[PDB]
Design a protein around this ligand. Structure first.
Ligand code: TW2
Length: 256
């Protein structure tokens, strides 16, 4: 197989391309290889250098098929650690949310929006450290210290922020904060609050009308629910920013 590496087993079968575990036969060094505006993805990946972000190793073409060498995460995905209808222990949820925020802070710091944060894209290494993966929807929202608004609609409807359904153009960062809130709900409740944040979705209307006696909100302790109250605000300008999330009571609660 490709140069020094053997493509042993498949780990992803998506609409982009597939992801294989590449064990080098020499050193035994094991990595992840993805097989295939992919020029766009590559140079975003070369930018990435943070412990809560999938490290890029390098690219290789073979006529028709491109090969992306990235840090392996042998722990699978966060999705796999969420029990349906239950979620996970609140302390594990807090640790993952800490690592997730660190990751999103980094990306935003280098002027990058991921645009498709959800548990399927949050992989774990062997010591259960979270890594933000899949920069195939990722784009630059800040360059030479000037922000550009987004207008491409993308991501996954249950994770997606309301402004993306309604506004012609919108700020990148509140969109990623929003989806982080949906991920936090899923970790604490083991279900997603709504199919879409649209005025035509009952469960979303129920949330705007603060009916937290309904699921999934009633499975969630008052401390994190208060943070979810600040994160899932429909007006992107009133929605909490990451610096202010970092000051939240539950974010700063000791748990084991
Ligand atoms: C299982 N697995 C991946 N799945 C691909 C994938 C799944 C979902 C969304 C996007 C996407 F690309 C990886 C990747 N990237 C991956 C990895 N880097 N290290 C270990 N295991 C991995």
């Amino acid at each position: 197989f490709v140069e020094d590496w053997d493509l042993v087993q498949t780990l992803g079968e998506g609409a982009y391309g597939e992801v294989q575990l590449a064990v080098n036969r020499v050193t035994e060094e094991a990595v992840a290889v993805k097989i295939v505006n992919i020029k766009k993805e590559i140079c975003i990946l070369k930018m990435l250098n943070h412990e809560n972000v999938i490290k890029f190793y390098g690219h290789r073409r073979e006529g028709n098929i491109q090969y992306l060498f990235m840090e392996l995460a042998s722990g699978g995905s966060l999705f796999d650690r969420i029990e349906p209808d239950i979620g996970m222990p609140e302390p594990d949820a807090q640790r993952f949310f800490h690592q997730l925020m660190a990751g999103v802070v980094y990306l935003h710091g280098i002027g990058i929006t991921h645009r498709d944060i959800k548990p399927h894209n949050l992989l774990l290494d062997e010591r259960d450290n979270l890594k933000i993966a899949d920069y195939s929807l990722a784009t630059v929202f800040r360059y030479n210290n000037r922000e550009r608004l987004l207008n491409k609609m993308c991501g996954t409807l249950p994770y997606v922020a309301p402004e993306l359904l309604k506004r012609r153009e919108f700020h990148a960062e509140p969109v990623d904060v929003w989806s982080c809130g949906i991920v936090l709900t899923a970790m604490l409740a083991g279900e997603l609050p709504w199919d879409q944040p649209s005025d035509s979705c009952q469960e979303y209307s129920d949330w705007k009308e603060k009916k937290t006696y309904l699921n999934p909100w009633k499975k969630i302790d008052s401390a994190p629910l208060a943070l979810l109250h600040k994160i899932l605000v429909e007006n992107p300008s009133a929605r909490i920013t990451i610096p202010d999330i970092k000051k939240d009571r539950w974010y700063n609660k000791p748990l084991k």
